[PDB]
Amino acid sequence: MEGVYFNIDNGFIEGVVRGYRNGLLSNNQYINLTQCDTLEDLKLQLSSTDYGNFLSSVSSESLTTSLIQEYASSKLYHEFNYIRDQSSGSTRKFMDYITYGYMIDNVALMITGTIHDRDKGEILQRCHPLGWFDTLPTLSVATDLESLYETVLVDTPLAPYFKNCFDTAEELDDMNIEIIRNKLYKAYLEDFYNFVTEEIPEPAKECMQTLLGFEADRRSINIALNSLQSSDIDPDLKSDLLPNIGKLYPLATFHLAQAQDFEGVRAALANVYEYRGFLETGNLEDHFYQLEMELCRDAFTQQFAISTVWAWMKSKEQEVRNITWIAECIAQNQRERINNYISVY
Amino acid sequence: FSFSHFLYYLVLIVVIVYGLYKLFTGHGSDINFGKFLLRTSPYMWANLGIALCVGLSVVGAAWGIFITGSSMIGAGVRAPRITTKNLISIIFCEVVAIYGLIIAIVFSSKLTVATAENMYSKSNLYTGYSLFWAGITVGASNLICGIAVGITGATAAISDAADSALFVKILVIEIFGSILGLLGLIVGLLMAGKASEFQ
Amino acid sequence: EKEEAIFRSAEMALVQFYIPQEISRDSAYTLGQLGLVQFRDLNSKVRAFQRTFVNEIRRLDNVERQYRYFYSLLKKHDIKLYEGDTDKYLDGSGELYVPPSGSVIDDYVRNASYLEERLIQMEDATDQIEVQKNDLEQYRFILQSGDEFFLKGVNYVTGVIARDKVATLEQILWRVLRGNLFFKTVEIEQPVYDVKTREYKHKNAFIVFSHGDLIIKRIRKIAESLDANLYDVDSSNEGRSQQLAKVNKNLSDLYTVLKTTSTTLESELYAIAKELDSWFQDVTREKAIFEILNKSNYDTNRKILIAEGWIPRDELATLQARLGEMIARLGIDVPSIIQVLDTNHTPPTFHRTNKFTAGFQSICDCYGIAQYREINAGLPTIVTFPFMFAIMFGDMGHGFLMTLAALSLVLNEKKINKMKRGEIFDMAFTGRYIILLMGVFSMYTGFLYNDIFSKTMTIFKSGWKWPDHWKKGESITATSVGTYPIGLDWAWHGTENALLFSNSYKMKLSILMGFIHMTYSYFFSLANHLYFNSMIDIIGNFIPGLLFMQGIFGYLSVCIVYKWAVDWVKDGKPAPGLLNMLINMFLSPGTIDDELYPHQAKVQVFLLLMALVCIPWLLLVKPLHFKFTDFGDIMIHQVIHTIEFCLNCVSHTASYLRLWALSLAHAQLSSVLWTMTIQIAFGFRGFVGVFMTVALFAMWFALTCAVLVLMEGTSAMLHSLRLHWVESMSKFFVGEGLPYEPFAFEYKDMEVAVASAS
Amino acid sequence: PVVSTGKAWCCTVLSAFGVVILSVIAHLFNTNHESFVGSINDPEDGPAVAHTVYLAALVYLVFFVFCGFQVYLA
């Protein structure tokens, strides 16, 4: 069984991340945060949680909605960097593969910001400190891709993912950079699924396979619903943007690659059982966040598994989205939709 | 390439070809496992039983101790009050080796010196066989018991760090998991009950 | 008059306080200067931002935030804090002083708010000079480099980059310029302290030669995107002379501007560094009293706060005798502001510890806080905990070294309890009477085991006699001419069967001491059940549990002691194996290999049958008395208590064999260390052998003081601790309780509060 | 001198226990004791090996008075 060899190098990590799980805000703590009047009341009410004394040394009057999520994210990222420094062998590779997906978003953000002639220093902020890679600010030169890959991207770990990307030889606009980002993310999800299948042991293997399948399915549905808009894409040129894994791959990605209107997407998801309750709703991303949280809650029942390191990392990032949504309503007096946070724990 | 599997397949090929050679030559009774059991000294079987009993019991205790101890130190960074509460999870893993001490104390009283004639008799061969398999039985049962109680102790430490009202309900599984080593002790003391010393 | 509360807990009382609002801030100091009231939270289920007295907390911890900023600003400019060591004008005798009154706290608040913006506008103006000092200091390094650094085939870029990024620049500029680069670099041996980041940052210079206009403008962007500081340098040597004479003369000017700007800030920090500590103590005592009134009710119709608090009942004559003094100070006749209330909550525990029981009580409190008015566990631990250590550490010589290491901490208590210890020497100092008793009992036990530094003593006459004569090398035996009065006989020393006799004694000693210890711990359960008036716990748990383990494992101890008292050679009967009849009492009942006493066969069957009727008499009488007055909360708990009480009898009585094991291994290592280090030097008569025994004695003494006293005295101490936490307190110690910890004032020590916050 | 805080005490304690133990060992080799001289594989000459232990006691006494003054400087 799995507990025999797991705790030789991952027992301290397991115990620390389960203790990190225990600081997730339950449903009553969000109600107590919702009842706050001003933002100092939100600070006092968050001081009685496992965030406690993190907005110390700020002010009583320099407290802003942006600053709250900056500090609440920096806490999360220091915790991730603490767990990754205590890992070795296969867990270190697992956490580097978690990091690469943020590196891709930093790459697309830097290339997009270079085109619109703006400052390098303002693209270097708002640029997600977890996927850093020290040679990143060198991407602000030489606005075509062939002078990017041949100078700075071959040394990055994103270098194997630029295989399907060299069909243009010109400069870049907002459409081409999103095509490059979707192709990089396809190659990333397929390589990380292949790493999970061949090298992670079983109770974490099946959990990470269903979590990465959910990530691939959400990418596929959003690429299909962002391609029926004011554009014209050949249907075999769109099947190169959909990842080859998940539970809607071998049939429904054939139909999503050919959907011409909004009713072609509802017809493609009508056959899959876990979906087709999603396209008649309020928000569409509030189904994906809810289903991701029900998947992450189910991953905390497996006790000897490193999927927990995923399931914590996505849950805590949901939590920082909730607090901001409360802090955007207290600072702006918009209490009408304040109870639309997403809470499972 | 699975080099150890290649070693396994080479051993199997050599065994099958050798036995088939002995059949077809006409000498299949030269591979005589019963004559090996009468010419081998009973002191070998008795001392392998004692040594493997205490060694395997100690190995199972140590395995269970690091399985429960790693998670108990990791779950004590945020909840340091679980430490002295969950110490009996380690106590259940460490009484596995005291059973191996007890078996090695009982069985070592039967290691007397036999005479040159009256050496490979029925009683001495019986005592060697009984001490060998009794030592293996209690040592293997204690290895299995120690690893199982260690897994349950790690899970109980995680559950105690979560909610303190859960440790009373996960402690029941460590009580079920610890009777296995005591049953191994009882069968080890009963397999060597009628065995005399080496007179 | 005042009770002792070391056998059981002290008697508590819940006290209600009706405090007027005009003396609410005043009486909180009176109840804080006497630290013997534990308040309880009456405003539960009220959110922390909705309680009263929350604006005062926000103002006072804004002041605490600013004081932490001041202490952090006393770093980077090494200025020591004042540390007024008069810890006497606040805490001490009398337990009643005068607090600062309102306007002093407001002067603290607006002084700390006035002085923060002063230090920010002086600390930013000093810090802006450093970033234009390091730039010109490293640009002065470029201008003194000779001619070979500036000459190799504008046509070059020059700058300073971190040493982390030199290989990255050279690799990127190799891939850009297609292998036609002329990169060159020289190191800088001193670290350049930056302010953007806050490390030391080994940097070095670089120069890149290329001819072009797009190529220079792209190499420049690549270089400055890797955080290199680029510079413009003339090509002629007169150009470097003019730039070294022009950029310098500004470094000395900027040094003069760096002083008298880093000097008034320096003097202001010297002004703040005096009496910052007293400010911090006053502000934290003010916030401490406002967090006690925060958990008490307040009426609106009448001007009355209502609080509850736990107090030891023998000190109800002290709240009245101090609050009368407080009212007599400022005369306002108030109507009976103390009332003793009857309750049905759980009061705290509070054992009084008086400096000799204190370390033993700290040892027993690491396991759990006792129930209210339960028998204390720290009172038997004064003797049994250093004496179970002594059996595992039975050496007359090592106990002498442990007493001498204990008396160098007891004979000077006053010098050490007023200095910092540091987490190992602290546990050595607070557990010094434990080490004293452990060493004394080690002397007694090693006198009975008859070994001093693995050598015997020979201080009586033996009970063994050797034959009259023999040939040199004959296996003789002794003749048993009597018995030996105290301890082991010294005629068992070499003897080639010393471990054959010497560990049948040491195995039975452990079983007897473990049985007597557990049966003494188990009567504390009867003494608890007879105090709390729980006559069903006597007949439901105590009596079957007593007849279970006394009918199995007490019979074994009677059989051990009786077999020693019978002469099995003068009588002509074979001595039976006690372990053999112990196994055959359960696994083959009725039969007897060798008869120990004349009616042994009926007693084995009666004691086996009695111990099997205690399995239905436990687990069944206790729940049914609940039903006929089952529920599941009682039945399943009693099933777990029964199959955990049984199966811990055998496990707990077998866990005491570590007494034998650690003693045997201690004696064996101390005997091998003698015969391998100091025994070698006894055969070296000469001049080389005088030096040889000095070195070999030094090695012997170092290993017998480090390996053999310290890290085996630590092992033998933590196995005696387990026998008290597990095998002793699983029979009387019921578990969970509430610690006392009243509301008092203490010195706060800012460095344990600045690192504790962020 | 020497460090005289962690190096003088570390030699004075070792030399103080070096005089006391080696003196009684040399005394128990001077008189035959059957524990120090009682075996066939054991020093034979008796009070001849008391001399070479007594000289080491004197050498440790020399170290004791030499390092005992070096803490007396302060």
JSON list of C-alpha atoms in Angstrom, two decimals, chain C residues 579-678:
[
{"chain": "C", "resi": 579, "resn": "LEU", "atom": "CA", "xyz": [8.08, -18.53, 33.16]},
{"chain": "C", "resi": 580, "resn": "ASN", "atom": "CA", "xyz": [7.13, -22.08, 32.15]},
{"chain": "C", "resi": 581, "resn": "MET", "atom": "CA", "xyz": [4.30, -22.28, 34.68]},
{"chain": "C", "resi": 582, "resn": "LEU", "atom": "CA", "xyz": [3.28, -18.73, 33.76]},
{"chain": "C", "resi": 583, "resn": "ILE", "atom": "CA", "xyz": [2.83, -19.78, 30.13]},
{"chain": "C", "resi": 584, "resn": "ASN", "atom": "CA", "xyz": [1.18, -23.10, 31.04]},
{"chain": "C", "resi": 585, "resn": "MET", "atom": "CA", "xyz": [-1.24, -21.34, 33.39]},
{"chain": "C", "resi": 586, "resn": "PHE", "atom": "CA", "xyz": [-3.12, -20.07, 30.30]},
{"chain": "C", "resi": 587, "resn": "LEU", "atom": "CA", "xyz": [-2.02, -22.20, 27.35]},
{"chain": "C", "resi": 588, "resn": "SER", "atom": "CA", "xyz": [-2.29, -25.62, 29.06]},
{"chain": "C", "resi": 589, "resn": "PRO", "atom": "CA", "xyz": [-4.37, -25.34, 32.24]},
{"chain": "C", "resi": 590, "resn": "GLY", "atom": "CA", "xyz": [-4.39, -28.06, 34.86]},
{"chain": "C", "resi": 591, "resn": "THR", "atom": "CA", "xyz": [-1.02, -29.64, 34.16]},
{"chain": "C", "resi": 592, "resn": "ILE", "atom": "CA", "xyz": [2.09, -28.92, 36.24]},
{"chain": "C", "resi": 593, "resn": "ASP", "atom": "CA", "xyz": [5.65, -29.75, 35.21]},
{"chain": "C", "resi": 594, "resn": "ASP", "atom": "CA", "xyz": [7.23, -29.26, 38.65]},
{"chain": "C", "resi": 595, "resn": "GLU", "atom": "CA", "xyz": [5.16, -28.68, 41.78]},
{"chain": "C", "resi": 596, "resn": "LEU", "atom": "CA", "xyz": [6.03, -25.39, 43.51]},
{"chain": "C", "resi": 597, "resn": "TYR", "atom": "CA", "xyz": [3.66, -25.60, 46.51]},
{"chain": "C", "resi": 598, "resn": "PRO", "atom": "CA", "xyz": [1.49, -28.54, 47.57]},
{"chain": "C", "resi": 599, "resn": "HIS", "atom": "CA", "xyz": [-1.93, -27.57, 46.18]},
{"chain": "C", "resi": 600, "resn": "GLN", "atom": "CA", "xyz": [-0.77, -25.68, 43.11]},
{"chain": "C", "resi": 601, "resn": "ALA", "atom": "CA", "xyz": [-3.16, -27.36, 40.66]},
{"chain": "C", "resi": 602, "resn": "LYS", "atom": "CA", "xyz": [-6.38, -26.07, 42.22]},
{"chain": "C", "resi": 603, "resn": "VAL", "atom": "CA", "xyz": [-5.06, -22.52, 42.67]},
{"chain": "C", "resi": 604, "resn": "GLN", "atom": "CA", "xyz": [-4.09, -22.17, 38.98]},
{"chain": "C", "resi": 605, "resn": "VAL", "atom": "CA", "xyz": [-7.59, -23.15, 37.86]},
{"chain": "C", "resi": 606, "resn": "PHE", "atom": "CA", "xyz": [-9.26, -20.91, 40.46]},
{"chain": "C", "resi": 607, "resn": "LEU", "atom": "CA", "xyz": [-7.14, -17.89, 39.49]},
{"chain": "C", "resi": 608, "resn": "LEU", "atom": "CA", "xyz": [-7.64, -18.51, 35.76]},
{"chain": "C", "resi": 609, "resn": "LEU", "atom": "CA", "xyz": [-11.39, -18.83, 36.30]},
{"chain": "C", "resi": 610, "resn": "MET", "atom": "CA", "xyz": [-11.55, -15.72, 38.50]},
{"chain": "C", "resi": 611, "resn": "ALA", "atom": "CA", "xyz": [-9.71, -13.64, 35.91]},
{"chain": "C", "resi": 612, "resn": "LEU", "atom": "CA", "xyz": [-12.21, -14.74, 33.24]},
{"chain": "C", "resi": 613, "resn": "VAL", "atom": "CA", "xyz": [-15.33, -13.78, 35.21]},
{"chain": "C", "resi": 614, "resn": "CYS", "atom": "CA", "xyz": [-13.90, -10.26, 35.51]},
{"chain": "C", "resi": 615, "resn": "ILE", "atom": "CA", "xyz": [-14.31, -9.82, 31.74]},
{"chain": "C", "resi": 616, "resn": "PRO", "atom": "CA", "xyz": [-18.16, -9.96, 31.97]},
{"chain": "C", "resi": 617, "resn": "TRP", "atom": "CA", "xyz": [-18.12, -8.16, 35.33]},
{"chain": "C", "resi": 618, "resn": "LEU", "atom": "CA", "xyz": [-16.20, -5.37, 33.75]},
{"chain": "C", "resi": 619, "resn": "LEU", "atom": "CA", "xyz": [-17.86, -3.89, 30.59]},
{"chain": "C", "resi": 620, "resn": "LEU", "atom": "CA", "xyz": [-21.35, -4.80, 31.84]},
{"chain": "C", "resi": 621, "resn": "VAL", "atom": "CA", "xyz": [-22.13, -3.63, 35.40]},
{"chain": "C", "resi": 622, "resn": "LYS", "atom": "CA", "xyz": [-21.23, 0.00, 34.68]},
{"chain": "C", "resi": 623, "resn": "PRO", "atom": "CA", "xyz": [-23.55, 0.52, 31.63]},
{"chain": "C", "resi": 624, "resn": "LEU", "atom": "CA", "xyz": [-26.59, -1.35, 32.99]},
{"chain": "C", "resi": 625, "resn": "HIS", "atom": "CA", "xyz": [-26.62, 0.77, 36.16]},
{"chain": "C", "resi": 626, "resn": "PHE", "atom": "CA", "xyz": [-27.09, 3.66, 33.74]},
{"chain": "C", "resi": 627, "resn": "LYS", "atom": "CA", "xyz": [-29.95, 1.89, 31.97]},
{"chain": "C", "resi": 628, "resn": "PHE", "atom": "CA", "xyz": [-31.83, 0.75, 35.09]},
{"chain": "C", "resi": 629, "resn": "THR", "atom": "CA", "xyz": [-31.92, 4.27, 36.54]},
{"chain": "C", "resi": 630, "resn": "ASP", "atom": "CA", "xyz": [-27.53, 0.57, 26.26]},
{"chain": "C", "resi": 631, "resn": "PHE", "atom": "CA", "xyz": [-27.16, 4.25, 25.46]},
{"chain": "C", "resi": 632, "resn": "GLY", "atom": "CA", "xyz": [-24.09, 3.78, 23.24]},
{"chain": "C", "resi": 633, "resn": "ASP", "atom": "CA", "xyz": [-22.12, 6.65, 24.76]},
{"chain": "C", "resi": 634, "resn": "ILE", "atom": "CA", "xyz": [-21.61, 4.50, 27.87]},
{"chain": "C", "resi": 635, "resn": "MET", "atom": "CA", "xyz": [-21.58, 0.96, 26.43]},
{"chain": "C", "resi": 636, "resn": "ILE", "atom": "CA", "xyz": [-19.03, 1.50, 23.65]},
{"chain": "C", "resi": 637, "resn": "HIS", "atom": "CA", "xyz": [-16.82, 3.64, 25.90]},
{"chain": "C", "resi": 638, "resn": "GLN", "atom": "CA", "xyz": [-16.86, 0.81, 28.45]},
{"chain": "C", "resi": 639, "resn": "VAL", "atom": "CA", "xyz": [-16.02, -1.80, 25.78]},
{"chain": "C", "resi": 640, "resn": "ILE", "atom": "CA", "xyz": [-12.99, 0.32, 24.82]},
{"chain": "C", "resi": 641, "resn": "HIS", "atom": "CA", "xyz": [-12.06, 0.78, 28.50]},
{"chain": "C", "resi": 642, "resn": "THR", "atom": "CA", "xyz": [-12.23, -2.97, 29.06]},
{"chain": "C", "resi": 643, "resn": "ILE", "atom": "CA", "xyz": [-10.27, -4.17, 26.02]},
{"chain": "C", "resi": 644, "resn": "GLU", "atom": "CA", "xyz": [-7.80, -1.37, 26.70]},
{"chain": "C", "resi": 645, "resn": "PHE", "atom": "CA", "xyz": [-7.47, -2.10, 30.44]},
{"chain": "C", "resi": 646, "resn": "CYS", "atom": "CA", "xyz": [-6.88, -5.70, 29.55]},
{"chain": "C", "resi": 647, "resn": "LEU", "atom": "CA", "xyz": [-4.04, -6.03, 26.97]},
{"chain": "C", "resi": 648, "resn": "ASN", "atom": "CA", "xyz": [-2.34, -3.18, 28.82]},
{"chain": "C", "resi": 649, "resn": "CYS", "atom": "CA", "xyz": [-1.79, -5.41, 31.84]},
{"chain": "C", "resi": 650, "resn": "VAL", "atom": "CA", "xyz": [0.61, -7.65, 29.90]},
{"chain": "C", "resi": 651, "resn": "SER", "atom": "CA", "xyz": [2.05, -4.78, 27.82]},
{"chain": "C", "resi": 652, "resn": "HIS", "atom": "CA", "xyz": [2.59, -2.47, 30.78]},
{"chain": "C", "resi": 653, "resn": "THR", "atom": "CA", "xyz": [4.13, -5.18, 32.95]},
{"chain": "C", "resi": 654, "resn": "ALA", "atom": "CA", "xyz": [6.43, -6.19, 30.08]},
{"chain": "C", "resi": 655, "resn": "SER", "atom": "CA", "xyz": [7.43, -2.58, 29.46]},
{"chain": "C", "resi": 656, "resn": "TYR", "atom": "CA", "xyz": [9.33, -2.56, 32.77]},
{"chain": "C", "resi": 657, "resn": "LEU", "atom": "CA", "xyz": [12.03, -4.86, 31.35]},
{"chain": "C", "resi": 658, "resn": "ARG", "atom": "CA", "xyz": [13.81, -1.74, 30.09]},
{"chain": "C", "resi": 659, "resn": "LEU", "atom": "CA", "xyz": [14.93, -1.34, 33.73]},
{"chain": "C", "resi": 660, "resn": "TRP", "atom": "CA", "xyz": [16.92, -4.55, 33.28]},
{"chain": "C", "resi": 661, "resn": "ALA", "atom": "CA", "xyz": [18.00, -3.79, 29.71]},
{"chain": "C", "resi": 662, "resn": "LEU", "atom": "CA", "xyz": [19.39, -0.27, 30.14]},
{"chain": "C", "resi": 663, "resn": "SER", "atom": "CA", "xyz": [21.17, -1.29, 33.33]},
{"chain": "C", "resi": 664, "resn": "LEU", "atom": "CA", "xyz": [22.81, -4.29, 31.62]},
{"chain": "C", "resi": 665, "resn": "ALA", "atom": "CA", "xyz": [23.93, -2.17, 28.70]},
{"chain": "C", "resi": 666, "resn": "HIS", "atom": "CA", "xyz": [25.23, 0.65, 30.92]},
{"chain": "C", "resi": 667, "resn": "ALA", "atom": "CA", "xyz": [27.29, -1.86, 32.90]},
{"chain": "C", "resi": 668, "resn": "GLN", "atom": "CA", "xyz": [28.56, -3.53, 29.74]},
{"chain": "C", "resi": 669, "resn": "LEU", "atom": "CA", "xyz": [29.69, -0.30, 28.05]},
{"chain": "C", "resi": 670, "resn": "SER", "atom": "CA", "xyz": [31.32, 0.90, 31.28]},
{"chain": "C", "resi": 671, "resn": "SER", "atom": "CA", "xyz": [33.15, -2.43, 31.54]},
{"chain": "C", "resi": 672, "resn": "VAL", "atom": "CA", "xyz": [34.33, -2.43, 27.92]},
{"chain": "C", "resi": 673, "resn": "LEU", "atom": "CA", "xyz": [35.53, 1.19, 28.18]},
{"chain": "C", "resi": 674, "resn": "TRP", "atom": "CA", "xyz": [37.73, 0.25, 31.16]},
{"chain": "C", "resi": 675, "resn": "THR", "atom": "CA", "xyz": [39.34, -2.76, 29.49]},
{"chain": "C", "resi": 676, "resn": "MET", "atom": "CA", "xyz": [39.97, -0.95, 26.19]},
{"chain": "C", "resi": 677, "resn": "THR", "atom": "CA", "xyz": [41.33, 2.45, 27.28]},
{"chain": "C", "resi": 678, "resn": "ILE", "atom": "CA", "xyz": [42.82, 2.55, 30.80]}
]
